Scaffold this active site. Structure first.
Site, short mmCIF file in Angstrom:
data_model
loop_
_atom_site.label_atom_id
_atom_site.label_comp_id
_atom_site.label_asym_id
_atom_site.label_seq_id
_atom_site.Cartn_x
_atom_site.Cartn_y
_atom_site.Cartn_z
N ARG A 154 -7.74 -15.76 42.60
CA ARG A 154 -6.73 -15.92 42.81
C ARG A 154 -6.11 -16.80 41.34
NH1 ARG A 154 -2.06 -18.36 45.95
NH2 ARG A 154 -1.08 -17.87 44.65
N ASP A 160 -6.19 -23.43 47.62
CA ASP A 160 -6.00 -24.19 46.42
C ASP A 160 -7.05 -25.50 46.37
OD1 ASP A 160 -3.40 -22.83 46.32
OD2 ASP A 160 -2.58 -24.48 47.60
N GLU A 170 4.48 -25.18 38.14
CA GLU A 170 3.85 -23.99 36.89
C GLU A 170 5.07 -23.47 35.69
OE1 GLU A 170 2.94 -21.82 40.34
OE2 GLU A 170 0.95 -22.59 40.45
N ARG A 199 8.86 -23.39 37.41
CA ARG A 199 9.32 -23.43 38.31
C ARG A 199 9.30 -25.00 39.12
NH1 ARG A 199 4.42 -21.35 42.89
NH2 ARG A 199 4.46 -21.91 44.77
N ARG A 256 7.77 -12.60 48.19
CA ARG A 256 6.28 -11.59 47.09
C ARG A 256 6.04 -10.79 47.04
NH1 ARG A 256 2.11 -17.58 46.22
NH2 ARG A 256 3.94 -19.38 45.61
N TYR A 292 1.39 -13.88 41.41
CA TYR A 292 1.38 -15.25 40.15
C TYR A 292 1.06 -13.57 39.68
CZ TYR A 292 1.01 -19.01 42.22
OH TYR A 292 1.66 -20.61 42.64
#
Ligand SMILES: [Ca+2]
Ligand SMILES: [Ca+2]
Length: 757
Positions: free
Chosen positions: A200, A226, A595, A611, A688, A716
């Site tokens: 990602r 993550d 972000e 963000r 999303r 993203y």
């Protein structure tokens, strides 16, 4: 994916039957390579029969077509007749423009199931070669647009029915004669997956110097998830495509070299394209494989850092990664006297009739009443440091009435500076030396204080200070010495509690104080290079810059990490100004900008989209899931754009996500910004789905409606101009898979610039 044919000139292979296409004619219907005056092309001859070329796709190919869209491009010459049919079809609908010459010889257009006839050209242009483009945008309520020679003719073409499934070009009528030379035919099904889940976080940039070279990045996430998971090892990956984003070389893990034992996790590949050396400079963060940003488990004494890798576009080689944590990860004791007052005192025994030397390395982040105080029993010397409404560093000395401009250049206004105080018993006065700079001399107030003291004084005056070192020496011996820089970076074993170390903490109201900086993270998308800084104070052209995420200890914010050096040496700017409020004792309410992405605007100012990560409302004043900030000094300090947040984008998604922003530069001279982000499946929702794209023609004051780019999972994203008419796009969609979109911004723009009544 591409599907095309083109006039190569040679015999054997110029035949569409060589380039993968199928023959579909009926008696007399013929074809042949013509080269009129050196004009190589395929002549279609639909005299007394249909002459037409087809190509058959797979179900998945049409699905992809429906999900991300397609575009058809035909360069041809209509020699005579009609029913010239160049189009696409899937088992249930098609879009069918019919290209022909009217009784009066003019070239004209008409669409199936659509009233109206439009003349494309007249005269002798009508038999000239021309560019014909069909563009399809996926949506619940889809459509396509037709362009002739970069102009837009018809838009909102409602798809009609058929059960025919294929791409076709030529003369589609057996009973209607049509003759035309096709120099080129191109069919593009949008989103080819370049990186697959669970990898990602992509970013992308393109060379302007070597047209065609694109460079995409993401995170190889082995285990998925993550950074910081004991159950993963994240690396950085790249793929380059020397053809506009059509084909891509093998996936390259820049990081495995760096992470021998997979002891680390790397994240957030933020590359910048540098026109002078024609290089991509990627920057990304490292963390130990078991701790990072999430949950703020990262500590200033773990291996968080920032590294870069340089890619030579000319020869396609990469240089081993370089570490630059030192230059950009601050190590300091930090004091936030926001809504509080915090002070640290050490009782000393200085013989006031004899000389002494004071040294403190301090940096003023914001506000005032941050101060340094030496008291030797008889008298007191106090340097009160504070930042101007003009953004200049000022010094108020004790007893004195007139403040001293200490620094004007915003950059120095927020950097470290060695404040020295030299005591002369002889004439009973002291002098101030800001980095060798002898400033003033003075004899402070008289007291009975024998002290060395620093911090934020007033509980009603907000300021924040960061210490790195304090020392006090008398007669050839160091009385006191505190090095925050050294301890900040120490494991918990090393005692660093000021109190336990000798000082007396004096604090009223609420404050917060911490050691060093817990971590730095470059950020998700790409960085820029500034080129309009000539009329901006103290910034320069050629600056390499990007908004990174700083995690102090508990709170996240953003700052610039830049290079006026072309990249060998790096700097750091101030953090974003956030509105704070204490809902209660030990309960702070602020935003946490994370972000982030920036575009250099026409005048030189810097525009930032950030963000909002944990809580978006402060003092009852709601901040969307996104905010914009502006910098008029090359990204040193920012200023919030009141009421320039999410709401600025009609139909944007209310979820919190990473977006992207860029500048689009037209050959003709004009420019604008492109902005990507999901919309949600229904009117601006928390979901999303359906990545959109806004533009802004007025330099980010406003934006113009989201044009939908995808039907389905959209996460993203990152956008960057591929060439004079294109913007390549990279997003996450199904199962986070990262797909590529080749948008024609020049044509799409037109769906917004026309006024009709
Ligand atoms: Ca890990
Ligand atoms: Ca981004």
């Amino acid at each position: 994916a591409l599907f095309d044919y083109n006039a190569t000139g040679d015999t054997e292979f110029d035949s569409p039957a060589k380039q993968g296409w199928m023959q579909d004619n009926t008696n007399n219907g013929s074809g042949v390579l013509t080269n009129a005056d050196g004009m190589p092309a395929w002549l279609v001859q639909g005299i007394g029969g249909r002459a037409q070329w087809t190509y058959s796709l797979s179900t998945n190919q049409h699905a992809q077509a429906s999900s991300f869209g397609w575009r058809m491009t035909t360069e041809m010459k209509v020699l005579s007749g009609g029913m010239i049919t160049n189009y696409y079809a899937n088992g249930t609908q098609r879009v069918l423009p019919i290209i022909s010459l009217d009784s009066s010889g003019n070239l004209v257009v008409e669409f199936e199931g659509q009233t109206g006839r439009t003349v494309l050209a007249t005269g002798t242009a009508a038999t000239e070669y021309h560019k014909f483009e069909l563009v399809f945008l996926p949506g619940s309520n889809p459509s396509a647009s037709f362009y002739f020679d970069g102009k837009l003719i018809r838009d909102n073409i409602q798809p009609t029915a058929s059960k025919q499934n294929m791409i076709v070009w030529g003369n589609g009528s057996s009973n209607t004669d049509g003759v035309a030379a096709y120099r080129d035919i191109k069919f593009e099904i949008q989103g080819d997956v370049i990186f697959r889940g669970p990898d990602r976080i992509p970013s992308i940039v393109a060379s302007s110097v070597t047209p065609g070279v694109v460079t995409a990045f993401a995170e190889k996430r082995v285990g998925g998830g993550d950074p910081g998971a004991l159950s993963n090892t994240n690396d950085i990956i790249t793929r380059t495509s020397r053809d506009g984003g059509i084909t891509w070389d093998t996936e390259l893990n820049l990081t495995e070299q760096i992470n021998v034992s997979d002891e680390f996790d790397f994240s957030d590949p933020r590359p910048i394209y540098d026109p002078s050396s024609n290089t991509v400079l990627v920057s990304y963060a490292r963390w130990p494989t078991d701790a990072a940003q999430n949950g703020d488990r990262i500590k200033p004494w773990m291996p968080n850092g920032i590294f870069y890798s340089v890619y030579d576009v000319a020869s396609g080689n990469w240089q081993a990664p370089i570490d630059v944590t030192d230059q950009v990860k601050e190590r300091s004791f930090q004091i936030a006297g926001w809504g509080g007052s915090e002070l640290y005192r050490r009782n000393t025994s200085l013989n006031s009739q004899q000389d002494w030397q004071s040294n403190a390395k301090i940096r003023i982040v914001d506000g005032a009443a941050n101060q340094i105080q030496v008291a030797d029993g008889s008298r007191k010397y106090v340097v009160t440091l504070s930042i101007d409404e003009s953004g200049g560093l000022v010094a108020n000395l004790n007893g004195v009435s007139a403040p001293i401009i200490l620094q004007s250049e915003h950059a120095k206004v927020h950097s470290f500076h060695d404040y020295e105080l030299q005591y002369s018993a002889l004439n009973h006065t002291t002098t101030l030396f800001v980095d060798g700079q002898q400033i003033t001399t003075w004899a402070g107030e008289v007291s009975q204080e024998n002290n060395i003291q620093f911090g934020n004084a007033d509980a009603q005056i907000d300021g924040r200070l960061h210490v790195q070192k304090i020392v006090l020496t008398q007669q050839g011996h160091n009385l006191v010495e505190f090095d925050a820089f050294y301890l900040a970076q120490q494991t918990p074993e090393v005692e660093k509690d000021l109190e336990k170390l000798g000082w007396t903490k004096i604090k009223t109201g609420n404050t917060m104080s911490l050691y060093g900086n817990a971590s730095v993270n470059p950020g998700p998308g790409h960085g820029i290079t500034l080129t309009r800084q000539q009329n901006i104070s103290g910034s320069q052209n050629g600056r390499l810059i990007y908004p990174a995420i700083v995690l102090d200890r508990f709170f996240l914010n953003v700052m610039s990490i830049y290079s006026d050096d072309g990249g060998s040496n790096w700097q750091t700017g101030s953090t974003l100004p956030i509105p704070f409020r204490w809902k209660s004792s030990s309960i702070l309410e602020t935003l946490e900008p994370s972000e982030a992405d920036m575009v250099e605007l026409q005048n030189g100012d810097l525009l930032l989209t950030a963000r909002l990560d944990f809580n978006q409302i402060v003092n009852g004043v709601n901040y969307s899931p996104r905010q914009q900030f502006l910098s008029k000094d090359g990204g040193i300090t920012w200023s919030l754009l009141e009421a320039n947040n999410a709401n600025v984008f009609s139909n944007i998604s209310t979820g919190t996500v990473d977006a992207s922003i860029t500048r689009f530069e037209q050959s003709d001279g004009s420019h604008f910004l492109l902005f990507t982000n999901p919309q949600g499946n229904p009117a601006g929702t928390n979901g999303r789905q359906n990545l959109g794209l806004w533009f802004s023609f007025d330099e980010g004051v406003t934006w113009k409606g989201p044009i939908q780019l995808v039907n389905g999972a959209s996460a993203y994203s990152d956008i960057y101009q591929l060439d004079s008419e294109n913007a390549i796009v990279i997003v996450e969609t199904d199962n986070s898979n990262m797909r590529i979109l080749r948008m024609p911004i020049t044509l799409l723009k037109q769906k917004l610039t026309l006024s009709q009544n």
